[PDB]
Enzyme design. Structure first.
Site: not given
Ligand code: NA
Ligand SMILES: [Mg+2]
Ligand SMILES: [Mg+2]
Ligand SMILES: [Mg+2]
Ligand SMILES: [Mg+2]
Ligand SMILES: [Mg+2]
Ligand SMILES: [Mg+2]
Ligand code: NA
Ligand code: NA
Ligand code: NA
Ligand code: NA
Ligand code: NA
Lengths: 1011, 1011
Positions: A90, A189, A406, A449, A525, A527-528, A592, A987
């Protein structure tokens, strides 16, 4: 030299970037976009060899093919052929963080190809090779002689091969390195793969050539007039006889043409560009481009002698449209956009990161079918064909540089470093140079990121200076820095502040109106969509609509990044992080998506579709107000079906044609509905149907829906006087009730209904018990693991509070014989380590009809973390084929994710009542159910339920869906109350307070009877 | 690899840039700027060998000293030792414009040195080598092994030698390339040389080390309080016991100190910089820095341990000053600056481009002594010591990146190219990293004459992001592009527009008020001081003073770039472009300095001194109003000397102390003067004298002056009526006059006074004739050459009109005898090819006192170009030692450059009346003269004159001053009128219309007698 460990060497002998070339020699073939004889594909079978390090590669491979080598398909990722392991990580880098150094053990892929070149290509002009995608760095030899080197895994690398190639047979030698200093800017990711994963081609160009061309469209105030401005650049000998003709086509009709010699206007004291020209064409009342109506023109660019000798022709699809940010709003053609977007990674379950037309089309069909109008290139320039498709089908594209750092500490360590500016700039500049002509691209992105560094500022300015047509956005370092024209946070909540030091994620509503702030907000980004997620989605779309300067977002993300693996029997199964021996890994965090790897929809996809609807509805008496959210198009392929039904039973229905202007309204008057006698709730349901097929959808497609409750007749009529009176039999262990062929058994030691009889057959395998827990969703778990526990996550809070192992202490269990019924009354306390968590008080009433009326009243302690559910469960002995219910459906729905669900009589096969999430969890719930039918059984009330062959224990004990074994019988879960699923991120706790079970005291009642 | 022909590779294994280090191991030594044992100078005697190309360099040189090699001094340019020729070209590149390639014949300088290291340096630590200046690119080897590669001629290149060094003898090997891809970014109008021309040294840092530090000073509203902010970065193993202390010193007094462990604030979602710390020191009432008062503090950065063990210390000088642009003005410490600036190239007549402390000090002293307060680093970062000296003496500095692409077509070809951004960035970024801590640097510059490209905008932003303390300027592409905070044109005129296409040079007064424009205007280049120039300089300074937003400029330029050559006799002579066989060359265009190469003043310098005065004056009655133009300092080292003279003879004088505050005013009452009874003009001359010596000036220094006409008494008494009578002798050929032993001869064919006698001795060697031409100044010629005529240039206009070869046709020549005199009347017509350009009508009158009164009346044709002069000229037999005259002086002055001149009795030796310009022209003129004395002669009237041993003919026929020979006797040029010299530029007519001889009809009268 070790060029793959030097951020100062990003290429060697590489040719300049440019828009897509084909080098046509016939102008009609250019216009029609038909295949070009000067553009050859080198895709096919190549010879491949794997090595542990570049040092290990044998010197002979440059001159001669290796015998150990294998014949492989190209493009491909060599991980997909099983040469080494694909790594999923990730944030943390797949290598030791020591810039610019990579491991001495660097998996090396040796590709080669023996191919043929026509004499004609070598007798004149220039013969080049284009490598569209090589991951992550590579050296190239041709016929044994070294050609060059190149980095950036996501943009074409081009080399001149004229002086290398001979007539007929030639041999390529491409040594590809898995790791390089390039990898430091490639920390997305996703799966970490390598190899020649995009197209390889040979392009013949004339010596005197088109080396670059920029197309621009600018407009008068009302967009009824446009000037198309095309700047064309050449290479080779400058001569007086040279001209450029830019012609503009609308199908077969030529609408504009311009012809000029070379030599641009005076630029500075030393003159102008004698190797350039700018053509300006007037275009009256131009057909505009949008995702709503993707109107396209064809621009042909002819380099020729004045006397009419076409030297070569290039071409592109042009979309007349204007993007600008004015007064804090993002405008396309003078109208404020509402970004119904998704983040899309280039992923295939079988092929990895190799993209194909079929797949790309399937994605775009599905996206547009679910009311998406935009896509984010997360997090790199895409396959060239993607931009062409978006141009044609209609999707606003955010094109994003291949810069992600990241796993740096801090995140901007490289991007603040001026020594890393050269490498970064090429990822931005060569992107712009390649894609700037595509109408579908509306916004540029500086990467993802990588914090905020001075390199982000320099590059932001560079794009503003080079391309005034498109806003530049970037999220790193706070999502509102000097590097972005749009506030573009990731996972900022609607109302809740997440005020982290230095980089807070403010409530999107709050963010817009911070002192001095003016810019538009579109989340890069949100609404995971991890596992059972998308709860709280409607909250976003209520806000997006209410607030002008909230202009939407990009859902994370499109497809689950799962990969196909095979078992001992040769059966395929979906695999994730760690399944390839890869370690460290971030497990199932690669999945995801709103769709599975094979593009099968998750239940969340329908929730996205309902919210992203282009027609809004309201109800007032008998009048339906239809409001269009389209900016440019009329409702010219739409009608409205309407249905009124009394609890599942159709009463009246009709069709009315939709005739709504963009932003407009239509009042549709419903015919006077004759109200029925029998009790129940009337339900209106409207559906927008497209009668005609389109490029993206088939005839009869449903683009929108809505439901309302109409009149209700509450039942005042009671059942008839019972034909008998049920008998009670008392033992020390049991209370037993008998009536007709029906029999109930309550265990007095446990206090639960432990068995039931219809006729003479058993009905239970596990007693009917209270349940306050669920197989934890991905949002329940968060980042918590066995090795590294996150105590703040829901699953750990439940675990630590003792919810999963709390045992039922019986407090009361009595039987009373009434005048027409038997009454079983119970009480239970759930305890852990001397703490009472839940008390469940029940009454079971069984009368002379054969019905069991259960009444549950539950107390939950205030200082115990709110329970996942408040309900009952049992294992029925029956295995029926169908599930029939009156409630929200047809698909899976949960309290914070049920807006797409409609109330009706639904009937599905058992298997559909289980959602095969690759990581198994609580799944398949249907809410607001008033009646449930399964085999001989009926449950009536106001409950939420799931029903499957898998127990909550099995679900929470299994890590992959393929390891799930159907249990004996059918596990039934009936809850009075269920907690929200969450998903604002995956998370940290994300279930909204209003969807948490925190009332302290809960009540629900069910009637269990045989239908 | 051919690393010098690739812009993608600008360095290999090179270390990061950073402020000046010394790796002090004692904190008191750091505070006092005393030498460091860790910083060794490798200057001295090296071994050198020359080669035609790198391919010619024998492979043995890497490990062994070449027997043929010579012993030379380093730093040095190898052209200065005569290994090849230095090339002067202005715009056109010294190589074929073929980016990125350079010539195959690429002169190579092989340098080597045998050295020894301290034992402890081998034991532990980091020993790096610093190359402050290598032109233009180089490879480095150590003890046979390759270390790295570097580019950019004007910034230090650093490489770690730790793993290369051994015990005993060590040997460096440096291969220096004259041409490289870096040459394309280095096209400054200057001599093109090569080699190791700046310092070489070794620095021994600890492994745990201060690697970077930035000092920032911010203030309150009235500057009574400041926060000094020091960010410190480290390399090596982080430890918890490590601390940083930044202490601030005012002499031997510590005013503020701050201590902290490592680990800065949180930056993003990944934390902060563990390897950094920022120290904030509060400073009450800071002594502020300016050019007027360069108040300096010392900051010492200590990397030490918490228990008190110093690991190492760095340090710099700190000047508490604030630079900002507010409301269209450039402010320094809240006050609008007036930039009295000059451009300075790093040049020396003997050492070429090698700079020494003595020279740098000599320049600053002369600059400050001539009222300059600012310098531009045209066009590259300077020798490190220049900035230190500028801090300490007080000079505003524009630090300019080494990027000039002047000879490109168009000028921005490279700078708009994204593939040149990497190489461009390093030249800007490594400059800022090196010089940002210097208080003298007030403005960053993106380079010079490289058009305007996207790269400029990106790099502009990068600095604005990294260092908000300083404005960024850049002139290219029209001097007002989006890449500059300041309007900074080169050679824009005061009132006259030059509306060039695309890149106009507007009137600076007009420019400011252009629609929408708000920025300040400071010319980066103005008043081209080529040869006899700087005419119209006062026009700039009047405008600068009147207009707030006109804030001055930088003169072009400081010093003549002429090199010493030697003739066969051994005599040194000033040489310019072409004098080394260099071709193509731009001849004398390398000499545009206010001083000669040996720092001897041109006349133009005193005009710059006078116009850049800090004290303004006005007269009203007997009251002088003195106004201070100083912003910060009080007049604390100044007294006024006032002088009153009647036509040279002193009448009254005195002293008054100056007690003026900055921007303040002072009134000085003059004591009632003795009213002179005798006729004449009274004059007042005031002077500002500095009683006390300073760091930059001697005791008694004169800093300002001004002159006024006071009362005048006109002469009304007639001369003594003489006794004798002149006798006329008529002849076919001649008119003759006798009186005593004085005799005059008038040639009746030519119409001129051909001879004069006193006794037997004759007075003329050439007849007295009319002169309408001058030996063309550099501003008369411009770019015009024999091989390429510029017809627009003043010299060519005269040439074409036949001014230089026009012949005197005699129209009239009559003699008349009067009662007390003889009257000779003449008339001449000047004709070229039948066109009468000029007509001269004269009357000569010789009375009984031997005084010859000449009356001249000239007609000039309106269609002929205006004449350079209107006067007489002759060659006298006499050679006298002195020149005594009553007029403007003592220095050479012309109509548009006579403001610094003062009216008085002046007496100079003859050679002082000559100005030794390297390229000879009309020179040494003095205007406004009422009396002139030379030998036995006296001329009276109101004329302009020069007098030398050189004819106008010789001056225009001779291209170098050293080739001039003294002619027999003395040439005299008495003009009634003389055209302006011009100098706004030196490539087109620049002489302002009011200094052009265009009246059509002119009158003047001279009296010649023998006292
Ligand atoms: Na992900
Ligand atoms: Mg590299
Ligand atoms: Mg045609
Ligand atoms: Mg792991
Ligand atoms: Mg609704
Ligand atoms: Mg190079
Ligand atoms: Mg004066
Ligand atoms: Na909105
Ligand atoms: Na599970
Ligand atoms: Na001023
Ligand atoms: Na010059
Ligand atoms: Na001359």
């Amino acid at each position: 030299r070790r060029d793959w460990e030097n951020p100062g060497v990003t290429q060697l002998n590489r040719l300049a970037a440019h828009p897509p070339f084909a080098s046509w020699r016939n102008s009609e073939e250019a216009r029609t976009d038909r295949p070009s004889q000067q553009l050859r594909s080198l895709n096919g079978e190549w010879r491949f060899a794997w090595f542990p390090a570049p040092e290990a590669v044998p010197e002979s491979w440059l001159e001669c093919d290796l015998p150990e080598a294998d014949t492989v398909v190209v493009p491909s990722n060599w991980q997909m052929h099983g040469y080494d392991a694909p790594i999923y990580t990730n944030v943390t880098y797949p290598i030791t963080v020591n810039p610019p150094f990579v491991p001495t053990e660097n998996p090396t892929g040796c590709y080669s190809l023996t191919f043929n070149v026509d004499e004609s290509w070598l007798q004149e002009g220039q013969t080049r090779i284009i490598f569209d995608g090589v991951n992550s760095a590579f050296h190239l030899w041709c016929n044994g002689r070294w050609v060059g080197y190149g980095q950036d895994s996501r943009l074409p690398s081009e080399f001149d091969l004229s002086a290398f190639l001979r007539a007929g047979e030639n041999r390529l030698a491409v040594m590809v390195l898995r790791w390089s200093d390039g990898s430091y800017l490639e920390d997305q990711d996703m799966w970490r793969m390598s190899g020649i994963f995009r197209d390889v081609s040979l392009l013949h160009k004339p010596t005197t050539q088109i080396s670059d061309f920029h197309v621009a469209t600018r407009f008068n105030d009302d967009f009824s007039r446009a000037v198309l401005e095309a700047e064309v650049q050449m290479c080779g000998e400058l001569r007086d006889y040279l001209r450029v003709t830019v012609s503009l086509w609308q199908g077969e009709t030529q609408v504009a043409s311009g012809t000029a010699p070379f030599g641009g206007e005076i630029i500075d004291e030393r003159g102008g560009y004698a190797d350039r020209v700018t053509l300006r064409l007037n275009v009256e009342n131009p057909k505009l481009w949008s995702a709503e109506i993707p109107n396209l023109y064809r621009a042909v660019v002819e380099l020729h002698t004045a006397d009419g000798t076409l030297i070569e022709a290039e071409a592109c699809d042009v979309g007349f449209r204007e993007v600008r940010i004015e007064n804090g709003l993002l405008l396309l053609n003078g109208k404020p956009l509402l970004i119904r977007g998704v983040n899309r990674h280039e992923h295939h379950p079988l092929h990895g990161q190799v993209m194909d037309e079929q797949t790309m089309v399937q994605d775009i069909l599905l996206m547009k079918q679910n009311n998406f109008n935009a896509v984010r290139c997360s997090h790199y320039p895409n396959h060239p064909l993607w931009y062409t498709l978006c141009d044609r089908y209609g999707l606003y594209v955010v094109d994003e540089a291949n810069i992600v750092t990241h796993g740096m500490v801090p995140m901007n360590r490289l991007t603040d470093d001026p020594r890393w500016l050269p490498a970064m700039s090429e990822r931005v500049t060569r992107m712009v140079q390649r894609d700037r002509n595509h109408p579908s691209v509306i916004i540029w992105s500086l990467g993802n990121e990588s914090g905020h560094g001075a390199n982000h500022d320099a590059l932001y300015r560079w794009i503003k200076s080079v391309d005034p047509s498109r806003p530049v956005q970037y999220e790193g370092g706070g999502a509102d820095t000097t590097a972005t024209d749009i506030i573009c946070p990731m996972y900022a909540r609607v109302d809740e502040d997440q005020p982290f030091p230095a980089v807070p994620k403010w409530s999107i509503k709050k963010w817009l109106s911070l002192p001095g702030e003016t810019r538009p907000l579109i989340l890069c980004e949100y609404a995971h969509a991890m596992g059972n997620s998308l709860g709280g989605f409607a909250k976003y779309w209520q806000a997006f609509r209410q607030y002008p300067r909230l202009q939407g977002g990009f859902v994370w993300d499109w497809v689950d990044q799962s990969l196909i693996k095979y078992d001992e029997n040769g059966n395929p199964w979906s695999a994730y992080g760690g399944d390839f021996g890869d370690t460290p890994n971030d497990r199932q965090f690669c999945m995801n998506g709103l769709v599975f790897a094979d593009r099968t929809p998750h239940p969340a996809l329908t929730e996205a579709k309902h919210q992203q609807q282009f027609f809004q509805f309201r109800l007032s008496g008998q009048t339906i107000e239809v409001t269009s959210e389209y900016l440019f198009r009329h409702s010219d392929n739409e009608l409205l079906h309407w249905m009124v039904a009394l609890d599942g039973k159709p009463l009246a229905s009709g069709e009315v044609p939709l005739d709504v202007a963009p932003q407009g309204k239509q009042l549709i008057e419903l015919p006077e509905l004759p109200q029925p006698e029998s009790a129940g709730q009337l339900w209106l349901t409207v559906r927008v149907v497209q009668p005609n097929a389109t490029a993206w959808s088939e005839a009869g497609h449903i683009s929108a829906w809505q439901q309302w409750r109409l009149a209700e007749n509450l039942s005042v009529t009671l059942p008839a006087a019972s034909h008998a009176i049920p008998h009670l039999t008392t033992s020390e262990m049991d209370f037993c009730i008998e009536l007709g062929n029906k029999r109930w058994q309550f265990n007095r030691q446990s206090g639960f209904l432990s068995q039931m009889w219809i006729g003479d057959k058993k009905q239970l395998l596990t007693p009917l018990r209270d349940q306050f827990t669920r197989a934890p969703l991905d949002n329940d778990i968060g980042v918590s693991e066995a090795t590294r526990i996150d105590p703040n996550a829901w699953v750990e809070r439940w675990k630590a509070a003792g919810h999963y192992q709390a045992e039922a202490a019986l407090l009361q269990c009595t039987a009373d014989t009434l005048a027409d019924a038997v009454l079983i009354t119970t009480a239970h306390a759930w305890q852990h380590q001397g703490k009472t968590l839940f008390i469940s008080r029940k009454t079971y009433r069984i009368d002379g009809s054969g019905q069991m009326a259960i009444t549950v009243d539950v107390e939950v302690a205030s200082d115990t973390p709110h329970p996942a559910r408040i309900g009952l469960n049992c294992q029925l002995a029956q295995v029926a084929e169908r599930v029939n219910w009156l409630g929200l459906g047809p698909q899976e729905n949960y309290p914070d994710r049920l807006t797409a669900a409609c109330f009706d009589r639904w009937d599905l096969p058992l298997s559909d009542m289980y959602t095969p999430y690759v990581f198994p969890s609580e799944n398949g719930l249907r809410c607001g159910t008033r009646e449930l039918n399964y085999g001989p059984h009926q449950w009536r009330g106001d409950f939420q339920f799931n029903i499957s062959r898998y127990s909550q224990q099995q679900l929470m004990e299994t890590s992959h869906r393929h390891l799930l074994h159907a249990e004996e019988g059918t596990w039934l879960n009936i809850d009075g109350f269920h907690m929200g699923i969450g998903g604002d991120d995956s998370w940290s706790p994300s279930v909204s307070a209003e969807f948490q079970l925190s009332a302290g005291r809960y009540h629900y009642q069910l009637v269990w009877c045989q239908k």
